[PDB]
Amino acid sequence: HMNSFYSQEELKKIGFLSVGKNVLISKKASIYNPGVISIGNNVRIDDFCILSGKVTIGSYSHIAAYTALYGGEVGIEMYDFANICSRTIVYAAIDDFSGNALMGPTIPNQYKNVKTGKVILKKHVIIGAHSIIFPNVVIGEGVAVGAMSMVKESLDDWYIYVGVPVRKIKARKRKIVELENEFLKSM
Amino acid sequence: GHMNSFYSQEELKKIGFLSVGKNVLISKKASIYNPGVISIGNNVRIDDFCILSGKVTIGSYSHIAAYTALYGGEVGIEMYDFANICSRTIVYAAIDDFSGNALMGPTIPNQYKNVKTGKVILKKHVIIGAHSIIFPNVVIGEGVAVGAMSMVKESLDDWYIYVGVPVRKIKARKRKIVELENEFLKSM
Amino acid sequence: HMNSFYSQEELKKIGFLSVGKNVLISKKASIYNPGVISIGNNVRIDDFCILSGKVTIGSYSHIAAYTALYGGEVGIEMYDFANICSRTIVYAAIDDFSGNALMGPTIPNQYKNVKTGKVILKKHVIIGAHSIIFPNVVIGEGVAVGAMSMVKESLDDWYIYVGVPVRKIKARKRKIVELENEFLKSMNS
């Protein structure tokens, strides 16, 4: 009732492709295929998350509770200082909604029409709570997506976007760049 | 436990479903309440952190993705074959009156509430997009797709795509899947 | 496959600052720092709930499944007959989104700009499913917010609000206060 994280010792036994230091991962998260999951330094992953398939997270990243990263074979990668608020989903693959294909894991591949492509969250990206990131997009450096937003296309750097699907509403301030440098120097 | 969280077939048998078919993959991390009123057909996968509570009937060739709640209550939620539900969806067969005419929820005796109930049926080939909510007494017509983050309070016409809160019809669903279903069952 | 609630024996082992009678808490919920968590009578908290930090719940309240109450230091408080539909998040603190500050628990405080403020849900508040309430917000007595709502500012009493962010759409009926009084009167005589 203080925390649910793995000890450093249990972390080493998971079998991650790579795992940094100061990594706090909830025992109530699910991790599938850990040998294609890579995690940098100073990363917290909270209860009821799902990481499945190829996922790469850098350093100084919080993946908050309920967040699903479905990396599949193509991968999701997050750069340093990116953070995801609770209940986000990032899909690297999704079925065709149009009616031109059967759907999902109970059906053989030949009848489906999966949209897939690597998803990247660049440095300083923040994803607002209850958001969905669809496949084959890059969320630009310093981009903020508001809560309950839906993204289907790559997003231009250093803007804040809101809505379903998102629209640009204003520039993201770049003082965090200054602070990153100040912070890193301080160490 | 880093490959999958599903029950073995011998484990499923011990849950005590009204009926459960073959090639059924149900996460040990999902919750299942009143399994004696739940039935599940063949080739079904239900993922981590789902909840199925009360009367839920699922056919064959269906994925209920992670975090989905199917609150069937006493009236029931029914999905037909080839229906699927994306992550984080909720389907309610019963909900409390929000007007201010009634008290609300499970801590309150029934005489003070005014629960709206009605079966929710998803017909063949329905797909429900992620983070959606379906409310009681709604028939989601054959082949309907509902987009992500959509809210459905009324029945939806067959073979159309709907989006928004609450949903609006935006374009017809293609029906190539009907051929595909036939070609796939014919392969078997 | 009947229910996931802690027995009364298990509950007493949790360590709440205060917990009342007829408290039904899912063992599949997460409770962090129960020492600052107070719960009244006739409360139900479902599977995959998270309660973390300073949370005070009154009586006749259902916290439905997936709901997360991040009370932090400043606290989240719910008055009696308040209820929260599934998959809501209530934040008593959040990071600055603007780009003026670094973010999240991996960064020291001096580089962040956290907004914080007590969040209060008054009597008879209902929060629709899949909603978010932000910090420093008082949800007025009898307020309903609809499904998928986002609330960043305090809400005036006895109205229904919907949308992201919410707008006031209609009055909420007050018959519920007459029912509260009827209900409580029957418990007494």
Ligand SMILES: *SCCNC(=O)CCNC(=O)[C@H](O)C(C)(C)COP(=O)(O)OP(=O)(O)OC[C@H]1O[C@@H](n2cnc3c(N)ncnc32)[C@H](O)[C@@H]1OP(=O)(O)O
């Ligand atoms: S990690 C903990 C989780 N934190 C969060 O999820 C925080 C998310 N914050 C937000 O979604 C904010 O609302 C942001 C995106 C930061 C915008 O806040 P601002 O204060 O910068 O802007 P306004 O509130 O003035 O709104 C600007 C226009 O955008 C609409 N809008 C704001 N937020 C959203 C969301 N999330 N979804 C849809 N629309 C949103 C406002 O209605 C406003 O629209 P106009 O058309 O200009 O009125």
Ligand SMILES: *SCCNC(=O)CCNC(=O)[C@H](O)C(C)(C)COP(=O)(O)OP(=O)(O)OC[C@H]1O[C@@H](n2cnc3c(N)ncnc32)[C@H](O)[C@@H]1OP(=O)(O)O
């Ligand atoms: S099972 C794993 C999870 N998969 C999903 O949740 C997939 C959900 N897919 C979608 O929500 C798509 O956006 C769908 C519904 C398939 C629509 O995509 P289309 O490519 O057919 O259409 P457009 O992107 O051109 O959009 C048409 C109009 O509808 C608005 N819109 C699209 N999607 C939504 C949602 N989910 N919610 C509200 N509105 C939505 C677009 O803004 C566009 O609007 P106009 O007003 O016509 O410009």
Ligand SMILES: *SCCNC(=O)CCNC(=O)[C@H](O)C(C)(C)COP(=O)(O)OP(=O)(O)OC[C@H]1O[C@@H](n2cnc3c(N)ncnc32)[C@H](O)[C@@H]1OP(=O)(O)O
């Ligand atoms: S605890 C179990 C979970 N229960 C719930 O989440 C129930 C939530 N209920 C709702 O969200 C209802 O839609 C409420 C808010 C009670 C409104 O229902 P009403 O029947 O009173 O109102 P209408 O359907 O006539 O809608 C009024 C206007 O509001 C728009 N709207 C309704 N609901 C929403 C939500 N959730 N989000 C955004 N907008 C919403 C309708 O489109 C309508 O708009 P107009 O511009 O007036 O047409």
Ligand SMILES: Cc1cn([C@H]2C[C@H](O)[C@@H](COP(=O)(O)OP(=O)(O)O[C@H]3O[C@H](C)[C@@H](N)[C@H](O)[C@H]3O)O2)c(=O)[nH]c1=O
């Ligand atoms: C959400 C969640 C929390 N926890 C545990 C570990 C966390 O350290 C603890 C608190 O997490 P939280 O997200 O509720 O709060 P945090 O946002 O970490 O903030 C906390 O630490 C800060 C440095 C202080 N400034 C805050 O006042 C204190 O609330 O609970 C888990 O173990 N798993 C979880 O999923």
Ligand SMILES: Cc1cn([C@H]2C[C@H](O)[C@@H](COP(=O)(O)OP(=O)(O)O[C@H]3O[C@H](C)[C@@H](N)[C@H](O)[C@H]3O)O2)c(=O)[nH]c1=O
């Ligand atoms: C989401 C989830 C996943 N898992 C386990 C079992 C799954 O078989 C495995 C991966 O599931 P997933 O949803 O991440 O991915 P799937 O949609 O099953 O897809 C995967 O298999 C396919 C046949 C291949 N075509 C894909 O490239 C590979 O990603 O993880 C669970 O045990 N429980 C879960 O809730």
Ligand SMILES: Cc1cn([C@H]2C[C@H](O)[C@@H](COP(=O)(O)OP(=O)(O)O[C@H]3O[C@H](C)[C@@H](N)[C@H](O)[C@H]3O)O2)c(=O)[nH]c1=O
């Ligand atoms: C959502 C959830 C349910 N459960 C268990 C406990 C509950 O008694 C049971 C059913 O809960 P539910 O939320 O599906 O349904 P309820 O809203 O409790 O409704 C039901 O029970 C009432 C006493 C009756 N008055 C109703 O007619 C019957 O449908 O499942 C859990 O143990 N944990 C959970 O998170």
Ligand SMILES: [Cl-]
């Ligand atoms: Cl969730």
